[PDB]
Write a protein that binds this ligand. Structure first.
Ligand SMILES: CCC[C@H](CC)Oc1ccc(C(C)(C)C)cc1NC(=O)c1nnn(-c2cc(OC)ccc2OC)c1C
Ligand SMILES: CCC[C@H](CC)Oc1ccc(C(C)(C)C)cc1NC(=O)c1nnn(-c2cc(OC)ccc2OC)c1C
Lengths: 283, 280
């Protein structure tokens, strides 16, 4: 059905996903939590966060449950950001390990490996979040941790993206191929090997198109490849929107972890020491 | 009305209660919380104890947020023990200060003060908890903290709080219950048996007189005897749960240093912490 390299290409991506995606978040610990007790600069920031209002649930090995309901909109809308920054950083660290396992990624120059991950970090993080997202309950089920949302919501692009993508009912192979196509974006800022990364991206897209033809005869999956490519384009647009929105919040309320600071621009390898160090460390 | 000495008795008890009862729990900080992670017959008795009064904890925040802790189901039954040990220790400190403000209590020998507090600590604590208990929601409202019961009256402690709240007692009747319970002449280790009994009788007479003077005559003709019956039932619950606490401590230590003295884990030589608090 698939060519020998296509079969090996999917097997490597699926193996990398298994080795680097902590779906139960069993190794996510020592994270911050909400404590137990210039007009437009502050207004426009709040206008977006209301759509992303979530309640946190922390289940334990003994069966107990901690549940955090967020405060209502009235500096109280930034109570969950230190936790989300710790969670995002943990997810990105798994994303970094995902790229290190891919052979086509290791052979790139070290600065291109930094540039590619810097542009696809948010996109690969939301793709993984979609696999743990529950469309019915509106909850991201992250093992011990759960994030439950609190029409006017779908107006937010990130929310509409997760519902549209979950509605496609993608296989694990299609998800990990989306991650590869997003990661190997030749037109990211700072990329040097534009041609090599572009050639790699094209082979992943062909492999995705071929895989869909071999496993989706159903009419519900008509034009699924073109739908996926459109979603990846939309996710890249959402990346630019949220990355700039995040910088505004950091400007008013510092919350980014040291690794997240490198991702935002707050020698290439000299200003990305943590990312450079993580790219040299092995699994 | 009441005699001037009876009025001064209530005025001093109310003054002590005002100075020593943090009704809003504003100073109850730095407490432990459940984390985010033959001996058979010993554990057999322990499980039967903890599963009787399982509660869920709620934490309202200054910003309006709410933390809520649901307990597990049947070494998992020990998750709320450190928090309650912190809560009981804080409550008893206010109980100790309550007795120190009473002049009739300071004039007692230091050993009798230890014996009385040792036997009335649990009873005076549940009486104070009853005033912050909501019968409708089944929740003890301790300011920022709330303890909600989990889906009862079969348990005596549970029916006690509902029956006592049903009486709708005044502040003066509550603080008189505390005095009658504190000045129990038949506590273990009490020496001044006659003096404490005479004091308890004066508190009881004052309580009976207060009810006759501030309540409708026929509707509350047995309200005093209802109160005495509740105090009798509460003293039985004391020995039952204090024995229950000794079992749990034997298998799983959780009691704070002050609680250890309260349980038996020279009367002043084995109650040095309690002795120090009575001196200051
Ligand atoms: C599915 C979306 C994720 C998350 C999981 C349930 O949903 C949220 C829920 C509630 C909230 C608030 C409003 C209550 C705080 C936020 C979020 N979402 C983030 O916290 C988030 N998601 N991705 N990133 C991110 C990561 C990055 O690389 C490390 C670079 C740039 C990034 O943002 C441009 C971040 C910071
Ligand atoms: C009814 C109101 C109390 C409390 C508030 C909701 O209900 C509980 C709920 C759950 C639990 C567990 C089972 C989950 C731990 C326990 C308790 N109850 C105690 O934690 C308690 N209440 N009083 N005392 C006490 C005090 C003392 O000196 C002041 C001496 C000996 C004492 O115990 C014999 C204690 C230790």
């Amino acid at each position: 059905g698939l060519t020998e390299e296509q079969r090996m290409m999917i097997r490597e991506l699926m193996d990398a996903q298994m080795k680097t995606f902590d779906t139960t978040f069993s190794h996510f610990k020592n994270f911050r939590l909400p404590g137990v007790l210039e007009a437009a600069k502050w207004s426009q920031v709040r206008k977006d966060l209301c759509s992303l209002k979530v309640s946190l649930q922390l289940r334990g090995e003994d069966g107990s449950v901690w549940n955090y309901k967020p405060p209502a909109d009235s500096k109280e809308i930034f109570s969950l950001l230190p936790h989300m920054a710790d969670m995002s950083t943990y997810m990105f660290k798994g994303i970094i390990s995902f790229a290190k396992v891919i052979s086509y990624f290791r052979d790139l120059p070290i600065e291109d490996q930094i540039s590619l991950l810097k542009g696809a970090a948010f996109e690969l993080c939301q793709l993984r979040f979609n696999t743990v997202f529950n469309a019915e309950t509106g909850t991201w089920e992250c093992g011990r941790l759960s994030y439950c949302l609190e029409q006017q919501l779908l107006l937010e692009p990130m929310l509409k993206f997760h519902y549209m993508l979950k509605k496609l009912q993608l296989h694990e192979e299609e998800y990990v191929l989306m991650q590869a196509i997003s990661l190997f974006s030749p037109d990211r800022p700072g990329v040097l090997q534009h041609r090599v990364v572009d050639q790699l991206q094209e082979q992943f897209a062909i492999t995705l198109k071929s895989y869909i033809e071999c496993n989706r005869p159903q009419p519900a999956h008509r034009f699924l490849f073109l739908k996926i490519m459109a979603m990846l384009t939309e996710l890249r647009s959402i990346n630019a929107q949220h990355t700039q929105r995040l910088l505004r919040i950091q400007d008013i309320h510092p919350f980014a972890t040291p690794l997240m600071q490198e991702l935002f621009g707050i020698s290439l390898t000299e200003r990305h020491k943590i990312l450079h160090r993580l790219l040299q460390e092995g699994s």
